[PDB]
């Protein structure tokens, strides 16, 4: 098989963990336990070509941003993720992030991930955005900074119910070899 | 509060697996759990401030927990842990409070510190308030067992331990005329 390497950042508590766990087995954490860096290595399946993905899991913490930039090196495929269910997460999208993985992964491939979209039509979610005067993040909406940030590609996916996950993978893979 | 739900767990964590059932080996009593902190040490630089480019592979997550013996409360040790799969935790080095001889706050990264027993340890706590919370805890502990005495500071706010020059000067483990070796030719 073919060794790649999949480097996954975005704001904290987006979902980027969870996103992991449920693709290369399951179980869907409940409780929030935020990553301060993490590898794992999944062998996944794509067209015929067996590849070893190694998955480099950072920080979305402000509080650790500090080893982030040790784990950007060399990346084959770039995932940065938002949350469906917050707004400023996608503002984030193009107001931080970009710049920052432009920065440390000149040249590699990028795929905008829409996390928690399970959370697109709960009731709940939709109300209390109401407050912030705001509402859950639309495909249009996502698709738009995908296309305004480069990305080679815009996924949406709920790692609480599974749906679009595999998919987000299939895609970074066919991405990292390229 | 991500950091408060965090030690809970932890805590929690901690004492169900290495300080709640006496020992599997032999039915000796578990030490009583004080406190711990996460930390990140470097194996390709373990006694400094490693560069700014001493890649990820080289890091190593890990936890120091504080802990008394069974019988004597003044018997404390600290030891050094690795948590696995699973949630538990495997203890494997191990010191004595009293070989505590320095404790050195770093100027340049806000998380990190050394900690000088025998050797000397190079250690960054996962978050800046995490160290201060830690060395905090770590100095007022030595001070409560070892009859007010300290281990020598070295860039800390003296008053971050409700301590001053004077106090200080009078409780370092230096001030006693054979505790310093010379140096040689
Ligand atoms: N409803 C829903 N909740 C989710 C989903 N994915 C994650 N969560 C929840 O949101 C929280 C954050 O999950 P996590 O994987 O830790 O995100 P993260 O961005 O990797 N965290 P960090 O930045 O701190 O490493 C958890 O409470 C988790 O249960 C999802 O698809 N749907
Ligand atoms: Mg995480």
Redesign the pocket.
């Known amino acids: 098989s073919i060794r790649r390497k999949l480097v996954i950042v975005?704001?904290?508590?987006?979902?980027?963990?969870?996103?992991l766990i449920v693709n290369s087995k399951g179980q869907?954490?409940?409780?929030?336990?935020?990553?301060v860096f993490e590898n794992y290595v999944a062998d996944v399946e794509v067209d015929g070509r067996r590849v070893e993905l190694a998955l480099w899991?950072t920080?979305?913490?402000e509080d650790y941003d500090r080893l982030r930039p040790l784990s950007y090196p060399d990346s084959n495929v770039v995932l940065i993720?938002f949350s469906i269910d917050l707004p400023d997460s996608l503002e984030n999208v193009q107001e931080k992030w970009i710049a920052e993985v432009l920065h440390f992964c000149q040249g590699v491939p990028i795929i905008l991930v829409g996390?928690?979209?399970?959370?697109r039509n709960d009731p709940q979610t939709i109300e209390q955005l109401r407050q912030e005067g705001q509402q859950p993040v639309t495909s249009q909406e996502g698709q738009s900074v995908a296309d305004q940030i480069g990305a080679t590609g815009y996924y949406e996916?709920?790692?609480?119910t599974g749906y679009g996950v595999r998919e987000v993978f299939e895609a970074a893979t066919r991405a990292s070899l390229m | 509060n991500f950091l408060a739900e965090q030690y809970e767990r932890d805590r929690k964590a901690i004492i169900n697996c290495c300080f709640s059932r006496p020992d599997h080996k032999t039915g000796e009593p578990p030490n009583n759990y004080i406190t711990h902190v996460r930390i990140i040490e470097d194996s390709k630089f373990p006694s400094s401030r490693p560069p700014p480019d001493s890649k990820l592979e080289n890091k190593k997550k890990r936890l120091l927990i504080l802990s008394a013996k069974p019988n004597n409360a003044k018997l404390i040790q600290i030891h050094k842990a690795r948590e696995n799969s699973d949630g538990s935790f495997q203890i494997g080095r191990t010191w004595q409070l009293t070989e505590l001889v320095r404790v050195e706050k770093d100027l340049e990264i806000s998380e990190g510190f050394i900690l000088t027993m025998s050797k000397k340890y190079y250690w960054e706590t996962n978050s800046a308030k995490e160290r201060t919370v830690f060395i905090k805890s770590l100095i007022t502990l030595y001070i409560q067992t070892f009859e007010g005495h300290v281990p020598e500071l070295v860039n800390w706010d003296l008053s971050l331990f409700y301590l001053d020059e004077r106090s200080y000067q009078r409780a370092v483990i230096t001030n006693r005329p054979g505790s310093v070796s010379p140096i040689k030719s």
């Open positions: 975005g704001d904290g508590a987006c979902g980027k963990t969870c996103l869907f954490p409940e409780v929030y336990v935020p990553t899991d920080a979305g913490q993720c996390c928690k979209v399970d959370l996916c709920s790692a609480k």
